[PDB]
Amino acid sequence: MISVTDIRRAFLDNECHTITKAFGYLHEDKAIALIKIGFHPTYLPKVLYNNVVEFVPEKLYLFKPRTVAPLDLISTITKLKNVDKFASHINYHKNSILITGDKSLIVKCMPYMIISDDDIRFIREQFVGTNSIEYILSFINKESIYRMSYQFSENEIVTIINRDHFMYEPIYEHQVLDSDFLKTMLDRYGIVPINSGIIDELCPEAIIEILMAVVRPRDAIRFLDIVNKNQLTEDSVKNYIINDIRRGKIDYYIPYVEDFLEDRTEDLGIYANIFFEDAIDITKLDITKTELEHISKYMNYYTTYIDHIVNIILQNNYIDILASIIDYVQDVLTEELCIRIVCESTNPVPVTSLPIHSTLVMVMCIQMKYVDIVEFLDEIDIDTLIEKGADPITEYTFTTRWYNKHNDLITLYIKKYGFCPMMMKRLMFEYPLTKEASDHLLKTMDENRGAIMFFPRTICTLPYLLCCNYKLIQKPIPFKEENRNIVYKKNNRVLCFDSLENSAFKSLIKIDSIPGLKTYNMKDITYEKSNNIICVRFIPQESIHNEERRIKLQLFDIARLASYGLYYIPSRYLSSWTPVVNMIEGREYTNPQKIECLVILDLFSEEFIEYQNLGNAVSNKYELEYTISNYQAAINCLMSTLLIYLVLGSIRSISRTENFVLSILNIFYKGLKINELLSEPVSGVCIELNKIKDRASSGDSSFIFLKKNELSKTLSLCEKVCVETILDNNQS
């Protein structure tokens, strides 16, 4: 459990109403320490302003913009790369920032400043004679344009659209543009010319093509309005719009239909009533499932016929359609139907939209992993929820008032997250707790110190172990004298490096010193130098012919290298998958959307990085918001490699998937020198894996596509292997 002694002392001895207020009564030294690591309220009292400016300036945004001094603000954001959090400060002090005349400063601040016609006059004054005017203005935001009278020149508009393509949207509805300029922007940037500057009469084909290309409904409306002022609308255009309405594209055309298609309501059929109140009696029409899907978003126009529609839905078992109109059928929903919806619908419905909150409905929502199970507490007590397997501590719950209505939910929040600084920060500071709720929270955490509240399941979960802030101990490399009968390639290989300090060079040499590797072996290493450059000549191990054996033996080597402090970032397979970050922040995580390879390459192709530099390499490779430790980066690399070797390895495997998962994960243990065998149930994992295996033959693509939440059991097994990796490391 996170310690709360000091902040609870502050909360009680000053009779605060919120933990935010109590934070301000901490000793300035403790407050500043907490502020540095991000454990702070959303704002700070003025007494701390000088300490923040001196000791942690990047956190000045925690003061009201009026409280911050323009010099302090400008000194801070000059140093920072990301100033998103200073947006309201930057806007409030825009005049101070303009007066500086600093090109780099102004350009960094433009996306957050609401720029006025006067401000534009100041920029053209301070920068006349330089390339900078069209450069500075190219960083303007859509908010400035909406409130602006100024009109961009064409050069400005190009510079702006080169910097951010979709800035054409505010520009195109801000000002009248030359019609040849609109054509040039279409031929060259593919921008659809939706602007009042359209002057030439367009052929029926041209109108149909522009409609087929627009995406936002407001652009279709605008286009048609402009065009109708230039020319009459053809029967060819009218026909396409009716057929587009039949394809579900409705919002695009509501003004148009109401003004020009009044005499085509029989062609519009069931859709006509969206445009003309009760225009067609739909009971006399043959209604298709597709037509009901399209009008589901438009049911407020079919309330005259709501019974007929509901009846078609129930008679044809259109449960997804029933779910999509659930707000209109509250009176019809029996417990039986409520259950059907929960089990059969593609996407969940809100528990508040189910009028029946029986235990039976609740266990179906638990089975379907509904995120809003807490809403059954109007009928069912928290103990029955927990006994029946509910987890009400979700993101959904945080958007409700339930934490103030029920101190048992705050206790459950602590049991799930009391060790997790980011999640406790969120409840302590970013949730509108009551005095009594705030008191219960700090009391419960203070009287349950240590690990007792997380025993015996949570203390052995990966997120819990990531927040103990352990270390992975590296083992020293044993003496090597290679006696094995290794088959080497009949050709040598040369790798060159800019210097001998090169970390990749240093790890290649270290890996050569490591005994007992199965795939990463090298013969007859010679050196050649040219000033700083160092080249390594060597004869690589011949590749293992059996692909399944090769993949198993590569994971052994990965485990053995990790035990000695050498890791690799699997970014060629999972370019953005950092589940460790989710875990230490208390956020749920799921599988990546794809594996960017089909073939597991040999380990010679990867760059192995020292543990001591791993936190920095991982955070840079994945462009993380903040730098994670070497420990947490090591866990991410293992989690990534395990997922890749299980999924990709399965695909290329010829043995029974149950024996593959069990033997390659035991192979991983052996590389770690863990003497106990892995013995986990893999039946549920193998069903997930075999599904993906079957798409990989049918797909025929350059990547392996993974469906959302398809690998939950495989991920819990990757987690369990990492947990055992950490616990065994901590015994040594």
Numbering used by the authors: 1 to 732
What does the paper say about this structure?
We solved the crystal structure of VACV E2 to 2.3 Å resolution, revealing that it comprises two domains with novel folds: an N-terminal annular (ring) domain and a C-terminal globular (head) domain. E2 also associates with KLC, binding to the unstructured C-terminal tail present on a subset of KLC isoforms. E2 and F12 function as a complex and both are essential for IEV egress.
The structure of VACV E2 comprises two folded domains: an N-terminal annular (ring) domain spanning residues 1–454 and C-terminal compact globular (head) domain spanning residues 455–732. The final five amino acids of E2 (FKSSK) and all residues of the cloning tag were not visible in electron density and are presumed disordered. E2 is primarily α-helical, with only three short β-sheets being evident at the apex of the head domain. The central aperture is too narrow to accommodate actin filaments (~6 nm diameter) or microtubules (~25 nm diameter), suggesting that the ring domain does not encircle cytoskeletal elements to promote VACV EV transport during infection. Given the functional role of E2 in associating with IEVs comprised of EVs surrounded by trans-Golgi/early endosomal derived membranes, which are defined in part by their specific complement of phosphoinositides, it is tempting to speculate that the basic patch on the surface of the E2 head domain acts as a membrane recognition motif.
